[PDB]
Amino acid sequence: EYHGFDAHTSENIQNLARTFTHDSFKNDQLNPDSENFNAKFWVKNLRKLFESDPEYYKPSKLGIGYRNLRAYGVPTVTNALWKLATEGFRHFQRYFDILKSMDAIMRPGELTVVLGRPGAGCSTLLKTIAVNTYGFHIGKESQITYDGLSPHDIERHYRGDVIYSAETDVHFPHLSVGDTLEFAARLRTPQNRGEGIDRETYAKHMASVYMATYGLSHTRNTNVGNDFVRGVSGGERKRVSIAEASLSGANIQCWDNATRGLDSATALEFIRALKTSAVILDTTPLIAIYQCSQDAYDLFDKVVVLYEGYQIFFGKATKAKEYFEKMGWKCPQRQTTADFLTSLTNPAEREPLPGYEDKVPRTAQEFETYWKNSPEYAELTKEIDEYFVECERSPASPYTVSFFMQVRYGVARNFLRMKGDPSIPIFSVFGQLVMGLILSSVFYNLSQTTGSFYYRGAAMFFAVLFNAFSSLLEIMSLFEARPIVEKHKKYALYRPSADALASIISELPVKLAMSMSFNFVFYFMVNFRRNPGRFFFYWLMCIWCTFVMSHLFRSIGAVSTSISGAMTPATVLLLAMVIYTGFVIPTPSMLGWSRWINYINPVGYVFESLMVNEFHGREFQCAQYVPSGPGYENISRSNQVCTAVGSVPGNEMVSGTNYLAGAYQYYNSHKWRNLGITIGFAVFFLAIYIALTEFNKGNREIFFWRDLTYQVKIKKEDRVILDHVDGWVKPGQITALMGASGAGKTTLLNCLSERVTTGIITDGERLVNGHALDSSFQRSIGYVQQQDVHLETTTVREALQFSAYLRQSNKISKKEKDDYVDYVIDLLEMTDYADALVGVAGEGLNVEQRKRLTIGVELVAKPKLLLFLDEPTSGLDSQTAWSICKLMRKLADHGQAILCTIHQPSALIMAEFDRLLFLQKGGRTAYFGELGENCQTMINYFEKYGADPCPKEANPAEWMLQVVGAAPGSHAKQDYFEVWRNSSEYQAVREEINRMEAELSKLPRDNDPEALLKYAAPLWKQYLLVSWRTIVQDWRSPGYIYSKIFLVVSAALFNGFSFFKAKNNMQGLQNQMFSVFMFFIPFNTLVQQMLPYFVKQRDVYEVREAPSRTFSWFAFIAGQITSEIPYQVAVGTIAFFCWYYPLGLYNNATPTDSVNPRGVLMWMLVTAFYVYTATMGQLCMSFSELADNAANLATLLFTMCLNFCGVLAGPDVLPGFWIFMYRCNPFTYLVQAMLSTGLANTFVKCAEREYVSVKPPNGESCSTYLDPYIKFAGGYFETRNDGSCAFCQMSSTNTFLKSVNSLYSERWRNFGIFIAFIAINIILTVIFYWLARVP
């Protein structure tokens, strides 16, 4: 533990200094070897001395003195657009005072405490001290000085000399404490002239010395961790943050609620660490707290008390109590001074002294008037004026090290973090390699004949994609490291630009590894050009493409806030770049309005360069000559011709350059220019990213138990947790249940309520009115959890109504349920905000209101036996806890039985209970009986059995814990379990229990046949209510439906209008097929957006709803599945209307007069695809825990399905191994149905550049020579008035459709199969959620 710089800390510092000076070897009070030397002076002087002092001014102590300070300040998505319009009008074109006049002076080396109720303005005061005025303004008359400086100077020049970090202790979870402190140590070491001392050794010595000072020595080489990741103790992370802040040379530190959610034994340690920092390093700490112990308060020096923004006192912490006693108020006995000061601002509390009632302030104005009139204010004003006079009488870059070394240290820390967790790099590299292998398997050993042309094209396009999107995952790191960077920017350690540059540099090894592992496999598995120079140029182009894409992704991520928030707008841009690469829409077929996009497309140039590199100067053997078949067996090669874009009549080989110049319109003069253009793009995007990251940042039954014994199996060893604990509860009596940390009071509470999934009961017996527990027990009790888990959308009344409907008995009419909900709302004093959205804890209902809501939710179910409460008064201030205790007292008065577990209470709250049950270590009962008034009964019981008397001003809870021996540093005279066993009152307890069992057993039972039911409401009602609740929650989500609609509409519109009124030439059909292929890309983004709103529902259900037996698991999963169907259907209809019609696919149905069937079928297919997207996302999220893993798995499976969907390679070309994956795939049937419906039964008109020239035999006509082939296979011909024939190979679209294995007569069948797949998905979900999460 930590006891604040004791002898052992001094000797540790002595040893460290001895080792350091011995290492450096290779007056009397500074030499470690000599005696008469103490570590205090060494630590104080190490920062200043032992380092060359820059000529500039860098203060070593800041005391702040301010006078006349004052600060003032100023939905359903259907209404979201109107709200946005109103906000825009507000942007286009009264004052509320939060802090009133106040005076204060704070010298260096004094720890100051700010006291006040929540919302009193302490946080605003601390923000004003730390110059964090953003969000409000300060009056012009206020005089603020920092040892003679000004707020502007501190904000501009000496930033980092005053800091502010309130609750969120942000650290890299996977970085060791030693490394985390060494980072700041090295980044704060000045350079000047380092001769004599090695900088690295000095930084290590500073890190070790400050670790020893704050008692973190044992924590070295241990993960700092986070609330999720395991690591150092929660009480040591705060000390690590203090050590880091003080190590970066922060003079004035301000903390608020830093000790929130921490027990007294650790809040004391935190306060002690602050005190040592103040007294050794001479810093100025300010701390704002609500729950303070007397011992912790004894360490403070100056206290400032706030009352509704009015400063009522400021001075020595010891004199505040005397001053407010002179005021005329009375402090109740056994009340801590901090609690008294806080309660002095509560109208319910603060009972005046006798005789002082007539003259005593009652409102903040009177308090401030007296404070101003008091002589203490005069003395304070005199001191402040003297300080101002003294200050008046008496570095361009706030950072210390130069930019290059900031970048170097950022790179080093990035490498340390990567080595600490080799998950993202290794997984990314191996996933890339495996996906590359699988993809290349489709294009294995492309042939050298012209028949491979198309495939080669595809083989390049996808390559450009894989190198393009290889580094997409890297942006995730930016979101993990964003908070820390901001914090480190505030401390004035390194600019965010340095961090961005270091992040770019540190990922180069991973980019190199991925590029090698993917290209060296893909380029050679697919038989591209074998010339070494060609491969090297391909690798160079791919490397620069991935650089450009990585920088673009980083630039996008620099302004976003989440993966989904970045993906919603980024998907449209990425699709725009992908479609216009030059393969989906070759340049000759690009529309006029989109030709300009290709100019500014950084990926089109890469594709052009790669294709020019491959095809240029290459001769391909012909694979098919247009005149051929049984009719033509012996025809001179002169009359034939190859079926390629650049084919020349009578030539056996087609030239690659002609094909490129004719089909894609690329030339070899652009091979090298495009490399320069891509380098320019990379540099531009790097500059944009750096600029962005630099700038854009900112009850008749009685329940009892007898001889309960409970043991748990751990490490194959049986240890008893509860050893024969007996007790009872009664209506109208509150039974507090307390114990040490290891006493397992929570274990007893959970065991009594049957909420434990582990262990068995050995000897006990639980009885209700003398009868054994039946199956109706679990529904006849209420359980109020410590943590309040509620949906962020449903209002208070909606949540209460939902619980009432789904939990009360079915025979009760709806009107009675609503009446009882109103009664509960009235009884809890909740009427003020009965229609206020719960929302996140930050914005919405505060802690007290949330706790009241939870108690109401558990109450509306109408428990008949008991109401367990788990730590109701933990994590709340001293006033909210009192309010909750009063509410519990009222509930008990109304006729309820309560059994609550209390942790670290105060005397006043403790006085409000009727019975006490104390558990020693190991679950052994010490005392069990009424504690009387002011805990007199328990004190008398313990004293009369050989215990020291309780001090008059001691808190009974702490004294009890100490006498039992659980308190640290306390010795027990003898164990009290045994003395309690034979105490003359344990006999009374036994007699009472036996009498209750013998008498209450004769009371007639209330046999209700509906009670003995596992769930109160029938299954269909639960399913309907859960589905409606989820639908409403999605509707009210803050911009979740709008993101989905925008994404889908934008993608569909871009896809439709890129091929606007597409023609039906040979390349047109391929363009439309790839349009259908690219229609599916929004799948990944839709899944990513949808999953978190499933996570929220799952967490709420599992944490609270499931154990409470509100609705069955099947109801939950079925509701989640049915919730997304309506929104998906609507979005699919919108997408079809925005894609099918602009594409002009309806014209294809005009000749056959089948517009309506082919339109309805297409709409049904599109909606089915979207419903399938939702079902697949939910399935892949059913069994996994994190949303990221489910989204990644869904994307991987979707990509695998797309690879073998039949467009990239049909069944014949596909290797046999993968043939099964071409049949089990759910997208092949969808693609076939869509193509057959949209393209079948229409004519084909070949473009001018795709006609093939044929030279018929001498003395023959085009018809006479080509009719047999035309009959044998489709196509048509024209006369060119030059003796030749211009031939087109396709006359009707049915030929191409048959080539893709899509038939018009089978579309319906295909559609049906797809529906089956959706069905399967749903079924699997309803099964997997049972195997994985249901216990």
Ligand SMILES: CCCCC/C=C/C/C=C/C/C=C/C/C=C/CCCC(=O)OC[C@H](COP(=O)(O)O[C@H]1[C@H](O)[C@H](O)[C@H](OP(=O)(O)O)[C@@H](OP(=O)(O)O)[C@@H]1O)OC(=O)CCCCCCCCCCCCCCCCC
């Ligand atoms: C911080 C990020 C780090 C990123 C990594 C950094 C990378 C920086 C690298 C800088 C190195 C730059 C080297 C550029 C020098 C090119 C010298 C040839 C210039 C030229 O111009 O050579 C054209 C002919 C092919 O050109 P070609 O066949 O398409 O057409 C011509 C013919 O070559 C022919 O020779 C006739 O005339 P020429 O001789 O060319 O004048 C005519 O032929 P026809 O008209 O009859 O068809 C035509 O001109 O190169 C060929 O063969 C293939 C030869 C490979 C071309 C690049 C060399 C290898 C790649 C460079 C580095 C590889 C990757 C780097 C590491 C990877 C990962 C660590």
